[PDB]
């Protein structure tokens, strides 16, 4: 059940305006054949150019929406549009490029895919709403064959040079002219009614349509993301480490303990309401407080309505004590909240563009996250950086400069001179906090929150 059988049927109705008279009965086998490629009865780890939904979801970091539009079929110029917002015009002789032959166009295609994908994926998955020209245009920039390895590293090969007769991965592909063993999924096979725009625009107001190839390419990928990650969710699917996943996750746990520990010391709430992950543990297990959990899965579509989370009658009294929302995205936090909220606008290898302003954050699991909205935080303020330790000043077992900081809140600093232990810990905590922030996480707190209140927790 692993790969998509070439003997599987392919619904051709989508193709019959670009390809009038196309048989209603077709396999992948005959489609790949008609696209001008030959699989050659090949057991060599590339059984089909086309892949399952399941496979496409494991390989989401690899998704590039692709669309081709006639300009005036060997006769006429072709507009090539990618979900990177690029358009190339190929001649048979937002970014909008003038008409140029295939021999140069294929070079630019390799450079674009390599720069976009080298820090994301080992492959490309062309995400299609297939009408004909996209499929018949592949012969001009794609070569297939047995799975191979990069000529300069152990990475699987994604590109091919006709100049040197060699193979490269995305990192080593400079000057290569062919996409090598790409993958593709036609979204129109999934069983929709009506065209791309009518389907896309059900879910998403953020991508317009200027009637240009890059726009459909963007809408195709967006609709695909909606289907696979918003409406359907799957937290059993794992995803490989490609960046600072582990450091970020650790950072997140250290900042959550720090911020909540201090909140309790400063304002001594009698009850904390912990709203979100139904797996959550007390992030401050020593704290005096009544710790009450409330279960809420990460909202992949629209942010939760605080009205529906709280009212309908818990501690019932959510206005008692403090509410901890740690990546539990609501429309408007109450005034007595500690909040961690993912900023969907961050640029990183972990954050992929999503649906209707949301982003798809892929760190071990894929989490589609609703658009970041500043108005949710109106009852709060941004939490300032600080470091709080009540740990003893005792070094144990760094090469040092004395730390001076107003935000190192320790006995040693109170006493005039920060000890070496607290300077090592302060600098590790600040590095973790910077990691987490640049990963796109933002921190918000009740307005009464004042780190001045922490100093008298030593006397
Ligand atoms: C990708 C692809 C798929 C099919 C075809 N062509 C056909 O099926 C023939 C030619 C005219 C109608 O029947 N060409 C390209
Ligand atoms: Zn390589
Ligand atoms: Zn969209
Ligand atoms: Zn100290």
Curated annotation (Swiss-Prot):
Inhibited by Remdesivir antiviral drug (GS-5734). Mg(2+) 2 binds at residues 69, 211, 216. The active site is at residues 67, 69, 134, 211, 216. Residues 355-369 are annotated as: GpppA-binding. Zn(2+) 15 binds at residues 200, 204, 207, 222. Mg(2+) 1 binds at residues 67, 134. Residues 239-459 form the N7-MTase domain. Residues 49-230 form the ExoN domain. It catalyses: a 5'-end (5'-triphosphoguanosine)-ribonucleoside in mRNA + S-adenosyl-L-methionine = a 5'-end (N(7)-methyl 5'-triphosphoguanosine)-ribonucleoside in mRNA + S-adenosyl-L-homocysteine. S-adenosyl-L-methionine binds at residues 274-280. Zn(2+) 14 binds at residues 150, 153, 169, 172. Interacts (via N-terminus) with DDX1. Interacts with nsp10. This is Guanine-N7 methyltransferase nsp14. The chain holds residues 5949 to 6449 of 7096 of the full protein.
């Amino acid at each position: 059940p692993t790969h998509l059988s070439v003997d599987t049927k392919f619904k051709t109705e989508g193709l019959c305006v670009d390809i009038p008279g196309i048989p209603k009965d077709m396999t992948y086998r005959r489609l790949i054949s008609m696209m001008g490629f030959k699989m050659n009865y090949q057991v060599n780890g590339y059984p089909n150019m086309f892949i399952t939904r399941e496979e496409a979801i494991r390989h989401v970091r690899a998704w590039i929406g692709f669309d081709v539009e006639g300009c005036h079929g060997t006769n006429l110029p072709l507009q090539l549009g990618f979900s990177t917002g690029v358009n190339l015009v190929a001649v048979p002789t937002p970014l909008m490029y003038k008409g140029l032959p295939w021999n140069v166009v294929r070079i630019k295609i390799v450079q674009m895919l390599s720069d976009t994908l080298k820090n994301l994926s080992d492959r490309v998955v062309f995400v299609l709403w297939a009408h004909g020209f996209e499929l018949t245009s592949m012969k001009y920039f794609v070569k297939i064959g047995p799975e191979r390895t990069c000529c300069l590293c152990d990475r699987r090969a994604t590109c091919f040079s006709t100049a040197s007769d060699t193979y490269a991965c995305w990192h080593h592909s400079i000057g290569f002219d062919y996409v090598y063993n790409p993958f593709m999924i036609d979204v129109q096979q999934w069983g929709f009614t009506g065209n791309l725009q009518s389907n896309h625009d059900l879910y998403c107001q953020v991508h317009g349509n200027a009637h240009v190839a890059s726009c459909d390419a963007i809408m195709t990928r967006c609709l695909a993301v909606h289907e696979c990650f918003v409406k359907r969710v799957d937290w059993t699917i794992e995803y490989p480490i490609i960046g600072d996943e582990l450091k970020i996750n650790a950072a997140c746990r250290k900042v959550q303990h720090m911020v909540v520990k201090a909140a309790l010391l400063a304002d001594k709430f009698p009850v904390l309401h912990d709203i979100g992950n139904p797996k959550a543990i007390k992030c401050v297990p020593q704290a005096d407080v009544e710790w009450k959990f409330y279960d809420a899965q990460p909202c992949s579509d629209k942010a939760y309505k605080i009205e529906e989370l709280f009212y309908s009658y818990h501690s019932d009294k959510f206005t008692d004590g403090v509410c901890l929302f740690w990546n539990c995205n609501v429309d408007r936090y109450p005034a007595n909240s500690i909040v961690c909220r993912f900023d969907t606008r961050v640029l990183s290898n972990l954050n992929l563009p999503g649906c209707d302003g949301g982003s798809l954050y892929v760190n071990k699991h894929a989490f589609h996250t609703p658009a970041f909205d500043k108005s949710a935080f109106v009852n709060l303020k941004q939490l300032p950086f600080f470091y709080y330790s009540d740990s003893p000043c005792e070094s144990h077992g760094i090469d040092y400069v004395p730390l001076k900081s107003a935000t190192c809140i320790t006995r040693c600093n109170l006493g005039g001179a920060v000890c070496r232990h607290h300077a090592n810990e302060y600098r590790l905590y600040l590095d973790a906090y910077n990691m987490m922030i640049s990963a796109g996480f933002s921190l918000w707190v009740y307005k009464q929150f004042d780190t001045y209140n922490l100093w008298n927790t030593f006397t």
